[PDB]
Write a protein that binds this ligand. Structure first.
Ligand SMILES: Nc1ncnc2c1ncn2[C@@H]1O[C@H](CSCC[C@H](N)C(=O)O)[C@@H](O)[C@H]1O
Ligand SMILES: Nc1ncnc2c1ncn2[C@@H]1O[C@H](CSCC[C@H](N)C(=O)O)[C@@H](O)[C@H]1O
Ligand SMILES: Nc1ncnc2c1ncn2[C@@H]1O[C@H](CSCC[C@H](N)C(=O)O)[C@@H](O)[C@H]1O
Ligand SMILES: Nc1ncnc2c1ncn2[C@@H]1O[C@H](CSCC[C@H](N)C(=O)O)[C@@H](O)[C@H]1O
Lengths: 253, 253, 252, 252
């Protein structure tokens, strides 16, 4: 019970659990969806609903919002957290994988925001938080689909903020750095030199450590709450100082 | 003769000949494409090739680069200038329109950059200039597809700059304000109060006038030239001061 | 509460929203202000007040030393004091310009360094600079403010990089038009108060002025361990103002 | 040329690239610099040289007055002089901090105003400030530079808004690491010159230092009528440095 007591919260990509747990801890009714079935454990662990959903599919996006709305009784908050990547520069990425990344990372958040918004009207407003990335504000080598899709999500965040202000819905984004999620910890483990990749990714931040999912969750939680009542259209880095430097924030040269 | 003497330049959406005439006057061999057949007049007027092309279609994009490359003998410069919009917020825009805007404004530049890049290798490098918009850096009400697609193009510009640097290809964007295109001039002319509409749009800029297409062309020209040899990944506003203010640059408080 | 037992310094705390917000979460608050009214704020919340001119480097040193002594510890510094010198570069006098830079830019740098040495004693802390959207963009005839605030924005980044090893996070909030007494008075002494209010409301997508309490919440969050992985960030608290390339609350 | 007959002022023109570039396009160039070697630049290009300390407001006034008189007209001002003071906010001395803010921030403001009064006489002109990527981002131990340059960036916006009605465009270039004699000297005085060079080259996607001539071209363009609808813009000349969230020329 507390800051989101009784409120209905939708989380796309809730399988990690940090975001879902954070809202649940504050008394929210959480509906999460994920492609991976493990998300069921997260929902059971927190007294929330789970839906196995492929956000690539527009019919499935409609079904998720409808069924989650029905399960929760209301929609107050949407968190768009699901994302994919297609490794490669524009030279090497295949068009189908590019279009899949745009569909999931950019088109799905737009669509879900519209669907969730129609529900939020019924309760007088709400908040949307899009989990972008520092990779929506800057790029890196060989990650074109991610960079383009996330860059679009950043300006989409602004679009939605302007358009949904009349419905009393705030829309913001968080732009995480390197976060110690299982995916990032496996990427490290599968890299040519895991030990050096760990040190190199820690050192992308001024704080010289990976971010924790809980730390992203707190930012999302804040932006979704009434504590952030005069904040809409904002893109908040949660990157331990990464984007404060023009080089490696945790290793100047 | 000139800064582009002998060089092969591709211009997407060149029906407004400003960009093509600018390159042509500096001695370029210009291949332009456009959906509208009027672009033929532009090509004839400047001694260049014209291709009627629908950039929405990936097969047509491949055919354009292949045939333009063959016609010109070389590719040195690509200018991605074609764009469309689908009026509406996320609440009102139809998914097919949204996907068509993303295809044309975001996917097409990515694809065309890759194709053009393989040609530029043959001549030891070159330059790409994407025409984004101030609407890729900020949003406005009821223009979600444009804002999202252009936002993506801005970060894609960065991605391409990083990835294409090793090929000695610079990639930049120009971000125009309100430009006196025939579409813009007509909207003014058909508005209930043309003098008010004009004054409002002029006053989005500190210079309190619409930009001319020729002014955008000069920015594109500069960024594509060796005069800009240490400039890559940059997004240059051509907006007479619009993005320098947090409100109307030409109409304070 | 979230700052129970912690020592919090607020420059320009005479308004009171920020001070009240930290106090409400159990903080020991030391505020300073040029205006003596800040005493009421401190009394109202069980905190210490110091009448201080932040323009003067000796007074800045004395404030941190005496506030540190009064509170027993320093965990948080909020740099909120600011002034302006109306005019473009053409009309602003150099002495006024230099006074605005001293107060808005130099004072925050200096105070951050002083506060930082005291935060080491308690294992870290947080600094929040109250910049403005006027540090990210400009407006006509406000050059000193725009320049000083622009500097504070990048100084926020500098401090974040340098103070990270000391476990001190440094962020800024960039408010839009806030219904402070200064702002409410400007409206009131306007030839058309209703029009001025409507125009400034409409700078924001939410089409209202921000409340000082709303800025306070942002400052509170950024100063707390809930922003543990947030440093070097500039957070707009501007109801969507900077999300548009024109008036966010009145498109054309 | 693009500046045939036009009067161009260049502050800290001693390096010479910018001066040469304008001269090559037919400009009458007046440059100033603290270092007497700018006389060789002025002699080499048929321009005037003034030995000037831009820290001093009286000297700034005298420069514009005398350069204006020598040239007959002022069309363009390029503010290129800058200094730095080593250290974070913890270690920088306040006197050194204030001197950087005076030369890097106050001097361009002042010089812009002075030059602007001259440009009115010929119906307008252009100002280009040489800021830095270090005005948009920071690095460790360079607080004065980061703050001053950050201020110059937003000042560039302020001036653009205020000087638009006078038909004067104001823009900035934001250079990366440029192979000036100071930068190369630092590489040489480094414990590992080869490593330092490789590191600084790799701050750019193009994986080399910029040349002063390359900055000059950007300045030249922004000052010309080819850039007629460009004002208030900040143009990186950084070979892709600010396009990445890490080292643009060395990803991890
Ligand atoms: N199409 C899809 N449908 C549902 N969940 C998806 C999904 N694509 C990815 N996810 C989930 O979303 C999470 C990945 S996103 C991870 C954080 C951040 N948004 C990022 O961009 O990296 C995982 O839990 C993953 O399984
Ligand atoms: N699919 C397509 N194929 C080819 N040309 C296209 C196109 N879609 C649009 N264009 C052309 O691109 C131009 C419009 S874009 C105009 C400039 C800027 N990109 C903007 O968005 O405002 C016109 O010449 C138009 O006919
Ligand atoms: N030199 C100085 N010393 C101490 N307090 C000062 C001061 N100059 C201004 N103040 C105080 O600082 C406060 C400014 S608060 C107003 C908002 C401000 N523009 C910002 O966003 O930072 C006021 O209470 C004022 O009286
Ligand atoms: N106070 C001053 N008066 C005049 N010239 C100065 C000066 N301080 C520095 N200069 C000169 O102006 C140039 C500045 S060197 C550094 C400039 C670079 N664009 C940067 O932003 O770091 C040099 O030629 C230097 O000798």
């Amino acid at each position: 019970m507390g800051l989101f007591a009784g409120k209905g919260v939708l989380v796309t990509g809730g399988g990690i659990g940090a975001i879902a747990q954070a809202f649940a801890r504050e008394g929210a009714l959480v509906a999460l969806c994920d492609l991976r079935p493990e998300g069921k454990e997260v929902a059971e662990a927190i007294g929330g609903a789970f839906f196995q959903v492929d956000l690539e599919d527009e019919r499935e996006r409609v079904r998720f919002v409808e069924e989650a709305a029905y399960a929760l009784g209301r929609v107050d908050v949407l968190v768009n957290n699901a994302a994919i990547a297609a490794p490669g520069s524009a030279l090497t990425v295949r068009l189908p994988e590019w279009r899949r990344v745009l569909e999931v990372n950019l088109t799905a958040p737009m669509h879900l925001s519209a669907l969730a918004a129609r529900e939020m009207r019924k309760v007088g407003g709400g908040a949307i938080v899009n989990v972008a990335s520092v990779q929506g504000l800057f790029a890196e080598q060989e990650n074109a689909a991610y960079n383009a899709s996330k860059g679009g999500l950043v300006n989409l965040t602004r679009s939605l903020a302007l358009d949904l202000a009349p419905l009393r819905i705030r829309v913001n984004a968080v732009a995480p750095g390197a976060i110690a999620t299982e995916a990032v910890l496996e990427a490290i483990a599968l890299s040519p030199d895991p030990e050096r990749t760990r040190r190199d990714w820690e050192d992308l931040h001024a704080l010289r450590r990976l971010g924790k999912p809980e730390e992203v969750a707190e930012a999302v939680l804040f932006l979704a709450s009434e504590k952030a009542s005069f904040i809409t259209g904002a893109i908040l880095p949660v990157d331990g100082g990464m984007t404060a430097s023009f080089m490696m924030a945790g290793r100047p040269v």
